[PDB]
Amino acid sequence: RRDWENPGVTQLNRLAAHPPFASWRNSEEARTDRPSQQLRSLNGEWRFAWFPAPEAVPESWLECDLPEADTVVVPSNWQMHGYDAPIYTNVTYPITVNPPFVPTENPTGCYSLTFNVDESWLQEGQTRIIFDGVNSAFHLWCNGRWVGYGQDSRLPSEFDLSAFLRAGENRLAVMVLRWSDGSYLEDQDMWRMSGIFRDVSLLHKPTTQISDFHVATRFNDDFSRAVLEAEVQMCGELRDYLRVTVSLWQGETQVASGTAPFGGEIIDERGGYADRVTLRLNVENPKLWSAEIPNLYRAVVELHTADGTLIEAEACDVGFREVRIENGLLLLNGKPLLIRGVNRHEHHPLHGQVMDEQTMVQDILLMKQNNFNAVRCSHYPNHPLWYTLCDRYGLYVVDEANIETHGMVPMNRLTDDPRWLPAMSERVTRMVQRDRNHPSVIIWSLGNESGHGANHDALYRWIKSVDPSRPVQYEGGGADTTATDIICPMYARVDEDQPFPAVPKWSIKKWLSLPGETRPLILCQYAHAMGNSLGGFAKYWQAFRQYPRLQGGFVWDWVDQSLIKYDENGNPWSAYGGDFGDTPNDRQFCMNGLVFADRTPHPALTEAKHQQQFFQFRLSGQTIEVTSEYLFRHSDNELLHWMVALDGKPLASGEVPLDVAPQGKQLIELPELPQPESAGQLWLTVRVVQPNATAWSEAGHISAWQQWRLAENLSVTLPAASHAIPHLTTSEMDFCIELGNKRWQFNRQSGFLSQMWIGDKKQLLTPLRDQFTRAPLDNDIGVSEATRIDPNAWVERWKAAGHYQAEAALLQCTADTLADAVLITTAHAWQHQGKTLFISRKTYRIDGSGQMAITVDVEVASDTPHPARIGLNCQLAQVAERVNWLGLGPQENYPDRLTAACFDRWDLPLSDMYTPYVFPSENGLRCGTRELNYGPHQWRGDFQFNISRYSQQQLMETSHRHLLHAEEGTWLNIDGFHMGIGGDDSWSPSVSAEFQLSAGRYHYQLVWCQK
């Protein structure tokens, strides 16, 4: 039958979907969520053999172990065991588009397991097996006899094995197809893998059993009273002595309990459901659930007889909360949310798409620690434990059906086709049936990037009808279609419109007010964190705070999807698209996370944490006004620390307890501040510290900060007259200056400082020269490729203009002696194909103090693309252990991504000054720096800099960080000006005008002196 090439057959013999079950046979174990003896894990060592196609699988395999098989751990993706290569393609399908067929060469994973079954499970009741995740389709046999078939790689498939098992040893055989008609609905931008990659379990239920239960919580107008309603369905023979009790617990206190026999209310002319019952429990003053305070109760559903004998019990955590949209705003418990969200794929660099509790917990903690309160399940239902963790730690969740057909042309070709309505419907309905009792799920999503088709409208309405408690969203077809309750664009910019035909991406501020529009807008994906990115992130947050109906978004995305590979010596390195011989591929576009694959943060995470802070501040005189953006909790685990420093030197500090109600304000008067005895700028820094540990943070955690400049006292103090006058030595070839044991050499043909000595030690490996280019970031490159240039990308604009090929031509180089110093004057032009791109004019003034003051005045032709930077660079001869500067930090920061950095005196090891992006580029800059110290050198001015062992040339010629090698000495780039990095998206120019170097004439000045 080739069921895997027929969207009309998405399963055979599969049991109905339902919420998480454990069939406890003791109510207290169900209350406490303890492991149940009736739910067994079959995870562990299985037998596996790979075949190139299902036709190649031997019939002997059904009956007995293939000797060629290997023993492997399950769950797993077979690519992570090396059986075949994982493929990274973004939009283009990994197979020829010819639905519903798949390639004849279709990798097939034959897994099998010999295991025991106790006669107690077979003598009575039902034994089923549950495959939480099989990618992409599979046939199942038990003891050589065929059981069934399933599709949808992201929801559990369950089959009744009662009639197939025998007491003692049994053997399962599972044939997993990599490709199937289900693959047409699984074109998400991620690695394409396969296998039994989530848990496999055995569940025993009694013949008379709870087959489903739904929990709803409705409230009065001020949330001071609630009704918990639990609808329970059974399977088995109905008997008048059967009963259901539903009890609700708050910790160890029983809050409410109700019992009834089966028999629901009349529904229509034929009666009601004799096999169901609805229990209603009143709850006074319920503790409400939110991400701020995830209060939970426990609901235990017992199926029993009238005499009291328990048949079985099921249970769930319950969070009392209402989600609704009113008057254009998404409210939670009646208050408008501000979603500090992030999209998160299920990805591990070693295990592929298999998820474990430890990584999930790691992710949740880093998210909360970084001021995130929500997560979107991009783009499929997640492993079941994820929802339990979000319920208990507190994160709002968008649960999303596993439907993405991005690669079709047009994108809605299948979703507007009624023949694909059945397959799509199962991906939506079975997700709702599984997850509808989790309080953390607040919004349902119909999938991702599948255009807008009539099937979406049908499924939108199905959800609305079955579960009115949660809004439904969906971005395809323009982000504001009739299939979504929230305008939920991806990568729409704050102020700039992108009027694409048919599916324009308006500025978000404008979108809200289009004629007739009234819905809330929450971006389903925004600020693409690929490489050195997040430029402009603050612009989104300023808009979300100013516009009520802009209720936030989900950053794209949490974690880079890089995979580990090992080199010749066994050392690991991070790989991306194409690194497994996969082709076609989309190279580094699989790495868009705020964190690297191993969970180390990229510098962009701190920018997100700061802009997503829950306390806002204003200063007026001595007064700091703290405003709380919490909706529900008081600031009961926070104090404000303040510190005043003059140019990095601390002068005063204190701490004050914070007691701010949700949305309230607190005024804090700072004490009178003694005047500083010295020139310099006083800076005030405040930080919000949580003194006590929580379930998600350690004592001392810093959750918010802000700085302000206070008084400045400009220096008017005439230096101090020099003990000596430098000497100028002129030769045909050079101008040399000597002072004490120092010497500087200016080559007269190049017009640059080519060497500097301390004693007899040379300090430069390469001359000090202007630099107008950067090793291109992912955002500068976009989708441009050698094979297919995008002439609009910044890197191609700069290449084409000759920025990377231009050579300095000398126009002037003179030397003069002044009363106490020597002055070198130079002028250079940079040209390409006979056009002058840039003109740099400088003076170097070396005085009796040994300081060399450099003034730079640059002209940039108006018609050349605005340059990446305007600075100087050199390769220093020496290497030093530390870098110390007075400027913004401590982490990497760029003009359009420097809000989180603070002005202070920072000191880091040199390697911390390099950011190891997997695809190397310009990195490590720190802006707003007034003083930089390295070795015996010191540079003073108002500049941006980076310093590392890798030249820009090397960074730009190297595609993987593991292949970089430290060069001799230290490369120093010191910029008077540097372009923004952008990141609203990484496929079209996204640096805002205000961060482009378009002024035409630029001036900067620096002093280089010795320490």
Ligand X SMILES: OC[C@H]1O[C@@H](OC[C@H]2O[C@@H](O)[C@H](O)[C@@H](O)[C@@H]2O)[C@H](O)[C@@H](O)[C@H]1O
Ligand Y SMILES: OC[C@H]1O[C@@H](OC[C@H]2O[C@@H](O)[C@@H](O)[C@@H](O)[C@@H]2O)[C@H](O)[C@@H](O)[C@H]1O
d(CA 546, CA 919): 36
Q: How many C-beta atoms surround the C-beta of residue 260 within 10 A?
A: 15
Min CB(4)–Mg ion separation in Å = 5
According to the binding rule CB under 6 A, does residue 810 interact with ligand Y? no
Using the minimum distance from each CB to ligand X, give the nearer residue, 222 or 268. Answer: 268
Contacts by residues 429-433 (CB-CB < 8 Å, ≥ 24 positions apart): 429/17, 429/459, 429/462, 430/17, 430/152, 430/155, 431/155, 431/381, 431/399, 431/400, 431/401, 431/402, 432/463, 432/466, 432/467, 433/16, 433/17, 433/18, 433/19, 433/212
State the nearest-atom distance from the C-beta of 156 to its own copies, in Å: 7
Exactly one of 152, 181, 426, 770 binds Mg ion (CB under 5 A); which one? Answer: 181
Query: What are the backbone dihedrals phi and psi of residue 219, each rounded to the nearest 5 degrees, phi first?
Result: -135, 165
SS3 label, residue 44: strand
| Unique residue bearing structure tokens 């609630």 | 226
DSSP line for 781-801: HTT-BTTB--TTSHHHHHHHH
157 binds, among Na ion, ligand X, ligand Y, none (CB under 5 to 8 A by kind): none
Taking the complex as a whole, how short is the minimal distance between the CB of residue 497 and ligand X, in angstroms? 15
In the complex with ligand X, which residue's Cβ is closer, 269 or 568?
269
Give whichever of 24 and 544 is closer to Na ion, judged by the CB atom: 544
Ranked by CB distance to ligand Y, the top (closest) residue is 189
| Binding site partner of 638, from its own copies, Na ion, ligand Y, none, Cβ cut-off 5-8 A by kind | Na ion
Give the number of other CB atoms < 10 A from CB of residue 266.
Answer: 9
Q: Is-cis flag, bond preceding 349, omega within 30? A: no
**Shortest Cβ 890–its own copies spacing (Å):** 54
Q: From CA 136, how far away is CA 117, in angstroms rounded?
A: 28
Window 592-621: contact mask with Na ion (x via CB under 5 A): x-----------------------------
Residue 562 interacts with ligand Y (CB under 6 A): yes or no: no
* From 160, 229, 292, 457, residue interacting with its own copies (rule: CB under 8 A): 457
Q: Can you tell me which of 396, 420, 987, 1004 binds ligand Y, judged by CB under 6 A?
A: 987
- Which H/E stretch holds residue 611? helix 604-611
In the complex, least distance from residue 484 CB atom to Mg ion, rounded to whole angstroms:
17
Residues forming contacts to ligand X in the complex (CB under 6 A) are: 90-91, 189, 269, 490, 525, 589, 592
- Ranked by CB distance to ligand X, the top (closest) residue is 189
Least separation in angstroms between residue 460's CB and ligand X is 20
Helix, strand, coil shares, percent, the chain, to 5: 15, 40, 45
DSSP state, 500? -
181 contacts 95 by C-beta, under 8 angstroms: no
Q: Which residues contact 829 (CB under 8 A, 6 or more apart)?
A: 808, 809, 811, 836, 838, 839
Binding-site partner at residue 269 among ligand Y, Mg ion, ligand X, none, CB < 5 to 8 Å by type: ligand X
**Sheet strands (E) in 269-385:** 276-284, 297-305, 310-318, 323-326, 329-332, 335-336, 339-343, 374-376
- The Cα–Cα gap between 668 and 598 comes to 41
Cα separation of 553 and 822, whole Å?
58
Is residue 91 near its own copies by the rule CB under 8 A?
yes
Residues near 34 by beta carbon (within 8 Å), at least 6 away in sequence: none
Q: Are residues 933 and 905 in contact, defined by beta-carbon separation less than 8 angstroms?
A: no
Q: What is the largest CA-CA distance in the chain?
A: 113
Query: Of 491-550, which residues contact its own copies (CB under 8 A)?
Result: 500-503
638 binds Na ion (CB under 5 A): yes
Pull the structure tokens for residue 652.
């005063």
Question: In what side-by-side order are the strands of the sheet with 329-332?
Answer: 323-326, 329-332, 335-336
* Distance, CA of 269 to CA of 267 (rounded, Å): 7
Residues β-bridged to residue 811: none
According to the binding rule CB under 8 A, does residue 214 interact with its own copies?
Answer: no
Sorted by sequence, the CB contacts under 8 Å of residue 227 that are 6+ apart come out as 217, 218, 219, 280, 281, 282, 283
φ, ψ at 925 (rounded to 5°): -60, 155
3-state secondary structure (DSSP) of residue 976: strand
- Restricting to residues 502-531, which ones interact with ligand Y according to CB under 6 A? 525
Query: Which of ligand X, ligand Y, its own copies, none is residue 783 near (CB under 5 to 8 Å by kind)?
Result: ligand Y
Determine the Cα–Cα distance for residues 752 and 813; give it in Å rounded to an integer. 9
Q: Which of residues 735-794 bind Mg ion (CB under 5 A)?
A: none
Q: Is the peptide bond before 100 cis (omega within 30 degrees of 0)?
A: yes
With CB under 8 A as the contact rule, the residue among 387, 589, 794, 943 that binds its own copies is: 589
**Out of Na ion, ligand Y, ligand X, none, which partner does residue 387 contact, by CB within 5 to 8 A per kind?**
none
Q: What mask, x for binding Na ion by CB under 5 A, covers residues 545 to 574?
A: -----x------------------------
Is the Cβ of residue 525 or residue 628 nearer to ligand X in the bound state?
Answer: 525
Site residues (CB under 5 A) for Na ion, limited to 882-941 = 920
Using the rule CB under 6 A, which residue among 23, 90, 180, 402 binds ligand Y? 90
Return the residues of window 463-492 that contact ligand Y according to CB under 6 A.
490
Q: From the list ligand X, its own copies, Mg ion, none, which binds 490 (C-beta under 5 to 8 Å, kind-based)? A: ligand X
- Of 189, 416, 579, 770, the one binding Na ion by CB under 5 A: 189
Q: For Na ion, give the closer residue by CB, 414 or 658.
A: 658
User: Could you tell me where the beta strands, DSSP code E, fall in 848-917?
Assistant: 852-860, 869-876, 882-889, 902-909
Residue 168 touches which member of Mg ion, ligand Y, its own copies, none, C-beta under 5-8 Å by kind: Mg ion
**Please, what is the minimum distance in Å from the beta carbon of residue 865 to ligand Y?**
20
What are the angstrom distances between the C-alpha of 518 and each of 265, 294, 325, 512, 635?
Answer: 38, 30, 11, 7, 33
Q: Which is nearer to its own copies, 11 or 938 (CB)?
A: 11
Span interacting with its own copies, options 587-595, 750-758, 768-776, 833-841, rule CB under 8 A: 587-595
Residue 796 binding ligand Y, by CB under 6 A: no
Place of tokens 């591990």: 348
Report the residue from 526, 589, 914, 945 that binds Na ion according to the rule CB under 5 A.
589
C-alpha span between 754 and 737 (Å, rounded) = 12
CB 7, min distance to its own copies, A: 5
How far apart are CB 557 and ligand Y at their closest, in Å? 8
Distance in Å, CB of 222 to ligand Y, minimum: 41
- Nearer Cβ to its own copies (481/551): 481
CB closer to its own copies out of 193 and 354:
193
Instruction: Give CA–CA dist 621/628, Å, rounded.
Output: 20
Minimum gap (Å) between residue 783 Cβ and ligand Y: 5
What x-and-dash track marks residues 397-416 binding its own copies by CB under 8 A? -----xxxxxxxxxxxxx--
Binding mask 467-486 vs its own copies (x if CB under 8 A, - otherwise)?
---------xxx---x----
Please list every residue from 178 through 197 that binds its own copies, using CB under 8 A: 181-182, 184-191
Residue owning tokens 């197979």: 95
589 sits near ligand Y (criterion: CB under 6 A): yes
Nearer to its own copies, 153 or 247 (CB): 153
Q: Binding partner of residue 194 among ligand X, ligand Y, Na ion, none, CB under 5 to 8 Å per kind?
A: none
Choice from 564, 783, 808, 956 touching ligand Y (CB under 6 A): 783
- Site residues, Mg ion (CB under 5 A): 3, 6, 9, 168, 181, 189, 406, 449, 584
- Site residues, Na ion (CB under 5 A): 189, 544, 550, 589, 592, 635, 638, 658, 920
- Site residues, ligand Y (CB under 6 A): 90, 189, 490, 525, 589, 592, 783, 987
